[PDB]
Amino acid sequence: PRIQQTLAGPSTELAPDTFVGLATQAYQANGPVFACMLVRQLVFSSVRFRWQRLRDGKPSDTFGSGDLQILETPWKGGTTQDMLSRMIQDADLAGNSYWTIVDGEFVRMRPDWVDVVVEERMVGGQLGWRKVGYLYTEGGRQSGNEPVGFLAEDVVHFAPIPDPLASYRGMSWLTPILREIRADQAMSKHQAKFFDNGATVNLVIKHNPMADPAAVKKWADEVNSKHAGVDNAWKNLNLYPGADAEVVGSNLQEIDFKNVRGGGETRIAAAAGVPPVIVGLSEGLAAATYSNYGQARRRLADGTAHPLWQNLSGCIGHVMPDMGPDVRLWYDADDVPFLREDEKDAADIQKVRAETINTLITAGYEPDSVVAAVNSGDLRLLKHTGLTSVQLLPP
Amino acid sequence: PRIQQTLAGPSTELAPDTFVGLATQAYQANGPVFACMLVRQLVFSSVRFRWQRLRDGKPSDTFGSGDLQILETPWKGGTTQDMLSRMIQDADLAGNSYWTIVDGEFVRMRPDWVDVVVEERMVGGQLGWRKVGYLYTEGGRQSGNEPVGFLAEDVVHFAPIPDPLASYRGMSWLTPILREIRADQAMSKHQAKFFDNGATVNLVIKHNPMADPAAVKKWADEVNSKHAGVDNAWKNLNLYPGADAEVVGSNLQEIDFKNVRGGGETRIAAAAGVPPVIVGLSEGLAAATYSNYGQARRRLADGTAHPLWQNLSGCIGHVMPDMGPDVRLWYDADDVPFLREDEKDAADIQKVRAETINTLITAGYEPDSVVAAVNSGDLRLLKHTGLTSVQLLPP
Amino acid sequence: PRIQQTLAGPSTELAPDTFVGLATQAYQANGPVFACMLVRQLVFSSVRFRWQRLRDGKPSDTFGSGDLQILETPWKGGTTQDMLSRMIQDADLAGNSYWTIVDGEFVRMRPDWVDVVVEERMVGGQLGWRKVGYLYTEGGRQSGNEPVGFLAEDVVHFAPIPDPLASYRGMSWLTPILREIRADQAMSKHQAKFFDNGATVNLVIKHNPMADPAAVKKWADEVNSKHAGVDNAWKNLNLYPGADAEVVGSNLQEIDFKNVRGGGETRIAAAAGVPPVIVGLSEGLAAATYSNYGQARRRLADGTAHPLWQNLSGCIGHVMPDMGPDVRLWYDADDVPFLREDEKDAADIQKVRAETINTLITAGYEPDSVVAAVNSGDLRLLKHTGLTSVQLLPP
Amino acid sequence: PRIQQTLAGPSTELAPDTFVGLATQAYQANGPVFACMLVRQLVFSSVRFRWQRLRDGKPSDTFGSGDLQILETPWKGGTTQDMLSRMIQDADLAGNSYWTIVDGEFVRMRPDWVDVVVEERMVGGQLGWRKVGYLYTEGGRQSGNEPVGFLAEDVVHFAPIPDPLASYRGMSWLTPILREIRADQAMSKHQAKFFDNGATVNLVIKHNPMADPAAVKKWADEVNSKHAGVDNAWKNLNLYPGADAEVVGSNLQEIDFKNVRGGGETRIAAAAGVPPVIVGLSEGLAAATYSNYGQARRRLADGTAHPLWQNLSGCIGHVMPDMGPDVRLWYDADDVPFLREDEKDAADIQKVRAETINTLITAGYEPDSVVAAVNSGDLRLLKHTGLTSVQLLPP
Structure with missing residues (x-):
């Protein structure tokens, strides 16, 4: 909701400044948030990029070409993992990621400084806004530096979670859990404040009024001398008449906020979309x-990694050269040690399919009909040649 | 946010001084932090390096060459493990690790003494900062010694955790959990103070108001001598009229922090990326x-070990001679006992693929089509020769 | 952090004196610490040493030669086990181990007396320090004995845990658990002090004021005569008018510090890196x-024994003669009864591999392609000769 | 730290006098210590000795010779078990065990009466002490009898636990757990004192102040005679006006030390190296x-029994005739029922290797290449003859 009009320029949708505050108050100041974002960074930053062929609109075997050399080495002395980590961090903190390619390398673009330029859409009447390009200013808008612009067809924009109230904005998942983060920080502060302003008394001695203060101090010094330290343990305490001694503990079980800290961690993990x-x-x-680590691993992988990877590949593919209407950019996860169980399941499924195909071929059916039926799950496509692998007798 | 400019020198990004403080306050003064770092180092410093070839983008078999003897013996008297462990420790402590080749030997540079020199990037306006080279000085920035420069293509920079507010440096994972460490130290000190400041009496005796202090001392000495130790145990006590005796111990519930200390340990372990x-x-x-040690080991390995090795190989690959556009440096860990189960699972999966391939070929399909179908998981790519291994009959 | 300069000698990095204190206050004064270090000594001191061949940089079959005769018998009437135990103890207590070979035997070197000599490194400018040799003095530096030096290429240095703040130092894992050790010792002292200064009263008799002390003593003697011992049990106690009797127990449940002793043992074991x-x-x-002993055994072995063994072999191998650029020193664990399960797992993996290879050969593939594909996990390397083991019919 | 010099004699290292004290205070006066030592002795004294040959470093089949009859019958009337048990007991009590051959018979020397004679080592400065020989005296050092010398190559020295502060001696594992033993004895004495010093009354009766003592005695005798034992049980009691009766037993919660005594036993067992x-x-x-007896037995065996037997064989091998550079003395325990499960597992593993070898040979590989591949776990060493055991066909 940052639509505004310029008296001498095209309308631009503004960017926020919550990036710095979020980065300084959640990433570098909270435990659970840092842990979840670090797990995301480690996991979702190990894929590679390849072309995938399309026949009749259906995915098929993959192939590689020289045009993907830029993705393997995004810049001098750097790998794709650095790119993936940087864009994951940018999407997590600011909800947006901007990258442009200059002279064969990819230059990172700070999110909160980038502005999105739009223009009116004419049909007559007005129907929304049309995206044209980006405008980048050094050090912010008020810094007074000369801004430099770009074209919409040469900049990558990574916004996985769309902002409902805006047309070209992104949003971060840290916003709906600011209350939980603040509650956890306040709980930690309160629990730490016990060791700075809290008194731990052991014995409370009540003195007879008919006592000189100096004698009281001398008696207290003697008591401390005789009953202090592990060496002077398990002795007997003699009290002068008119005195009283009582044993007082503490309230150590008040700094325990497990029933609420657990809920806060649960909400933070749910927002992060990662099993605790x-x-x-x-x-x-x-x-x-x-x-039950296997089920959690399956949930995390199949519910977060693949959609994010495919969205990222789709966003990146628009800046790359055009192979045509059949070849599209896609990711590869054939040598990642996090999906070995999925690979085993796929291998088992394919083995069962092959055994079924062999069984159908044995009965004497036409091979193309058999493979079509297995690939479509429609027994009506089976066509019988008219011969059987077993001898059939007149009786 | 450490960008600085010199009136007569290139602008440089500055490095914080948390290295020595962290090393002297957490690494050598805490249990869980030291244990986590030791586990990380010992598990991670066991990998080896090899040249890996890729065929049409997808990787292939590895091969050795005479260019890797520098990695096998990084310095006289050293070993690959001695360098991997040092880099892991430096990265975990300060978030950076700088290495360079000096007359054919790898030489370490202290992270707190190394800066980064940058230059403006011109597209026209500035579009960030360009990494030019490095700068090193012995004894610290203010030591006054003559600085030593380098080049960005002869220095190994290892930073696995990017810093969103820093253009090029990384951050250490010990920063957001300082509160937990300080709380743990406070709890330990509160535990220790009990045996040095607190006292534990056995019997509390109240005497008659008119009793003579010398007589009280005599009676106390007598009763202490007659009821000392287990030798004079389980005896009877006779109290003169007007005297009382009570039993008041020390409440141990005060010295108990299992829940909060356990939560702190869990958070520290989660930040360290290692299962508890x-x-x-x-x-x-x-x-x-x-x-659940098998599940924990799988979690640790897949989540942390492989991406770290990949990043380390990527960083090391810069200073190596340019083998070509296909051969890239890649880690090898086939002789690490920590990863035997993954090799087992890969063996079973390979056997499943072999069974599927044999079954598909036996049915009468063209072998290369079968290979393609199993390598791509697409049955449409299968091609039938037109022949079957079963004797069909027209009747 | 012991860098210092000599007015008439090369700069030497000093050694500490905490060796004696640690040895006298932890090894010979604590139970858990002694147990963990004894387990380490027993386990990690049973390997042997052999040459391992390298083809294309990959490990292969092993072989033995006469140059390893020194390792089998480190000195007259001694085995390698004594060496391994001594260096494990030295690394555990002082963090360093020094051994030099003289006239065909290995002479042990006390850690705290050995000093490390360094020198400035010139590139210009200064880049760290360069290691040159060692200096050994009898009975310490102040003893006044004539020091004797050595060369860097003839002394073994075993430092498994590198000191972050120093270039050539080691560190012990006993340092971060000194607080836990002291807490356990204080707890034991406090629990033992109960039997020396603690009174265990059974009956408390309150006497009527109108009583002669001598009569009180006589009555107490009669009471002790009639109600003492297991023979005079379960009788009745008659009290003269004006008296009072009360039953008083003890506080035996105060010397129980399980909830803290367990945590201390946990921290000590975690520092030692051995399952409790x-x-x-x-x-x-x-x-x-x-x-669950099997999982703990697997954890201990595969997470501590192998990295320590390989680091030790790498450290030792530099003093041995040079076979060349393909043969390296390595350990052997083929007849240790602690890794039988690992041997069985490896045998199962190899059996599965062999069965897969036989299956692939049956289908009619070229054997070299089959073995390459199985050894590299890349189905694209398979090359088909063009023949099948089954008869294929025209129908 | 027992180095001493004589004004007219070679310097000698001294031996402490903890042998007799430990033997008379813990071995013959405590339960757990005696049980642990008995288990150790009985389990460990069952092994036999054989000559083992090594082929190219790796061991091979064993063989007997006429040189081992001295070990089979160490002395007239003795047996190998009688010597193994004595050495184990001496090592567990004093940390050392000295044996020598006297006219073809093994003779024991008391550890507390044996010293070690040393000489300065010259490289020029001193570099430690050289072990020259032994010294023995009957009745103790101060007994005044004439000492008897020996040579370091005719005396068997057994010390499995090295002493960091002692140049050559070892230490016993009972030293660091003396506190636990003393605490256990204190608890036992406190338990025993209850039945000798404490009293247990059944009924407490309070009488009227004006009651005649003779009348009170008469009433007490009558009520005791009418309410004694189970014969006069479950009756009614009539108390005269002004008399009271209460029920006060002895609180048994005082005599209970299950947690602390159990912890002490656990620590003693852990120090002894035997599962509880x-x-x-x-x-x-x-x-x-x-x-979990199977797991406990495996833990005990693998952790303790094998290394101790290896060390014992190494120590015994010194005094034996020099068979050569390949044959070395090695223990044999193939007829010990305690180790049947390990032999079972080895049999299964050998069967697995046999199956793998047969499968590999059947495929058509050269037999020696198969043997090498299975003995080294490297499939690259395999060699194909060029032949297959399946009838392939060009179509």
Whole structure:
């Protein structure tokens, strides 16, 4: 909701400044948030890029060409992992990521400084806004530096979570859990304040009024001399008449906010979209349980990695040269050690398919009909040649 | 946010001084931090380096060459492990690790003494800063010694965790959990203070107001001599009229922080990226359960070890001679006992693929089509020769 | 951090004196620490040394020669086990181990007496320090004995845990748990002090004021005569009018510090890097559970033994003669009864590999392509001769 | 730290006098220590000795010779077990065990009466002390009897636990757990004192102040005679006006030390290197669970038995005739029922290797190449003859 008009320029949708505040108050000041974002950074930054062929609109075997050399080395002395980490961090903190390619290398673009330029759309009447290009200013708008612009067809824009109230904006998942982050920080502050302003008394001695203060001090010094340290333990305490001694503990069980800290961690993890056990956090429990790590791994992978990877590939592919209407950019995860179980499941499925095809061929069916039926799950496509692999007798 | 300019020198990005403070306050003064760092170092410093070839983008078999003897023996008296461990420790402590070749030997440079020299980037306006080279000085920035320069293509820069507010440097993962470490030290000091400041009496005796202090001292000495130790134990006590005796111990519930200390350990372990059971830290429970050790090991390996090795190989590949556009440096860990289960699973999956391939070929399909179908998971690419291995009959 | 300059000698990095204090206050004064270090000594001191061949930089079959005779018998009437135990103890206590070979035997070198001599490194400018040799003085520096030096190429230096703040120093894992050791010792002292200064009263008799002390003593003697010993049990006690009797127990449940002793043992074991169950300690539990001993054994072996063994072999190998650029020193663990499960797993993996190779050969592929594909996990390397083991019919 | 010099004699290292004290204070006066030592002795004294040959470094089949009859019958009337048990007991008590051959018979020397004679080592300055020989005296050092010397190559020295502060001697594992033993004895004495110093009354009766003592005695005798034992049980009691009766037993919660005593037993067992269940000590629980006995036996065997036998064989090998550079003395334990499961597992693993070898040969590989591949775990060493055991066809 940053639409504004310039008296001598095209309308531009402004950018926010919550990037710096979020980065300084959540990434570098909170434990769970840093852990979840670090897990995301480690996991979703190991894929590669390849062309995938399309036949009749269906994906098929992949191939590689020289035009993907830029993605392998985004700049001098750097790998694709650095790119993926930087864009994941940018999308997590500011909700947007901007990259442009200059002279064969990719230059990172700070999110909060980039502005998006739009223009009116004519049909008559006005129907929304049309995207034209970007405007970048050094050090912010008020810095007075000369801004430099770009074209819409030469800049990558990574916004995985669309802003509902805007046409070309992104949003971060840290916003709806600011209350939880502040609550956790306040709880930690309160628990730490106990060791700075808290008194831990052991014995409370009540003195008879008929006592000289100096004698009281001398008696207290003697008591401290005789009953201090582990050496002077398990002795007997003699009290002069008219005195009283009482034992007082503490309130150590008041700094325990497990039933609320666990809920806060649960909300933070849910916003991050990562199972707590993968992060490692314990939420209301003595410790995290690793008995069901496989299901959590399956959930995390198949519910976060693949959609993010495909969205990222689609966003990146527009800046690359055009192969045509059949070849499209796609990711590859054939040598990642995080999806070995998925690879095994796919291999088992393909083995079962092959065994079914062999069984159908044995019965004497036409091979093309058999493979079509197996690939489409429609038994009506089977066409019988008219011969059987077994001898059929007149009786 | 450490950009600085010199009135007679190139602008440089500055490095914080948290290295020595962290090393002297957490690494050598805390249990869980030292344990996590030790586990990371020992597990991670075991990998080896090889040249890997890629065929049409997809990787292929590895091969050795005479260019890797510098990695096998990084310095006289050294080993690859001695360099991997040092880099991991430096990265975990300060977030950076600078290495360079000096007369054919790898030489370390202290991270707190190294700066980065940058130059303006011109497209016309500035579009960020360009990394030119490095700068090193012995004894610190203010030491007064003559600085030593370098080039960005002869210095190895290792930073696995990017810093959103820093153009090129990284950040250490110990910064956001300083509160937990300080709380743990405070709890330890509160535990220790009990045996040095607190006292534990056995019997509290109240005497008659008119009792003579000398007589009280005599009676106290007698009763102490007659009821000392287990030798004079389980006896009877006779109190003169007007005297009382009570039993008041020390409440141990005050010295108990299992829940909060366990939560702190869990958060530290989560920040370190290592499952608690592998480190060994019992947290909130009596002890750690080694029943889910397989799941914990798989989590640790897949989540952390492989991406770190990939990033390290990518950083090392810069200073190496340019083998070509296909051969790239890649780690090899086929002789690490920590990863035997993954090799087992890969062996079973390869056997499954072999069975599927044999079954598909036996049915009568063209072998290369079968290979393509299994390598791409697409049955449409299959091609039938037109022949079957079963004797069909027209009747 | 012991860099210093000599007015008439090369700069030497000093050694500490905490060796004696640690050895006398932890090894010979604590239970858990002694147990963990004894387990380490027993386990990691049973390997042997052999040459391992390298083809294309990859490990292969091993062989033995006469140059390893020195390692088998390090000195007269001694085995390699004594060497391994001594260096493990030295690395555990002082963090360093020094050995030099003289006249065909290895002479042990006390750690705290050895000094490391360095020199300035010139590139111009200064870049760190360069290691040159060692200096050894009898009985310490102040003893006044004539020091004897050595060369860097003839002394073994075993420092598994590098000191972050120094270039050629080691560090012990006992330092970060000194607080836990002191807490455990203080707890034991406090629990033992109960039997020396603690009174255990059974009955408290309150006497009527109108009583002669001599009569009181006589009555107490009669009471002790009639109600002492297991023979005079379960009788009746008659009290003269004006008296009072009360039953008083004790505070036996105050010397129980399980909830803190268990945590201390947990931290000590985590620092030692050994599972508690292997040590045998119970931490907050009634007794240690041996139901999951296999997982703990796997963790201990594959996370501590192999990295330590390879680091030790690399450190030792530099003093041995040079075979060339393909043969390197390595350890052997083929007849150790602690890795039988690992041997079985490796045998199963190799059996599966062999079965897969046989299956691939059956289908009619070229054997070299089959073995290359199995050894590299790349199906694209398979080359088909053009023949099949089954008869293919025209129908 | 027992280095001493004589004004007219070679310098000698001194031996402490903890042997007799330990033997008379812990071995013959404590339960757990005696049980642990008995288990160690009985389990460990069952091994036999054989000559083992090594081929190219790796060991090979064993063989007997006429040189081992001295080990089979160490003395007239003795057996190998009688010597192994004595050495194990001496090592566990004093940390050393000295044996020598006297006219073809093994003779024991008391560890507390044996010293070590040393000489300065010259490289020029001193570089430690050189072990020259031994010295023995009957009745102790101050006994005044004439000392008897020996040579370092005719005396068997057994010390499995090195002493960091001692140049050549070892230390016993009972030293660091003296506190636990003393605490256990104190607890036992406190338990025993209850039945000798404490009294247990059944009924407490308060009488009227004006009651005649003779009348009170008469009434007490009558009520005791009418309410004694279970014969006159469950009757009614009539108290005269002004008399009272209460019920006050003895609180048994005072005599209870299950947690602390169990912890002490656990620590003693851990120091002894034996799992608690094998010893049988219930610790903190009602009883010990024999369900994990297999895991406990494997832990005990692998952790302790094999290294001790290896060290013993190494020590014994010194005094034996020099067979050569390949044959070395090695223990044999193939007829010990305690190790049947390990032989079972080895049999299964050998069967797995046999199956793998047969499968590899059947495919058509050269047999020696198969043997090398299975002995080294490297498929690259395999060589194909060029032949297959399946009838291939060009179509």
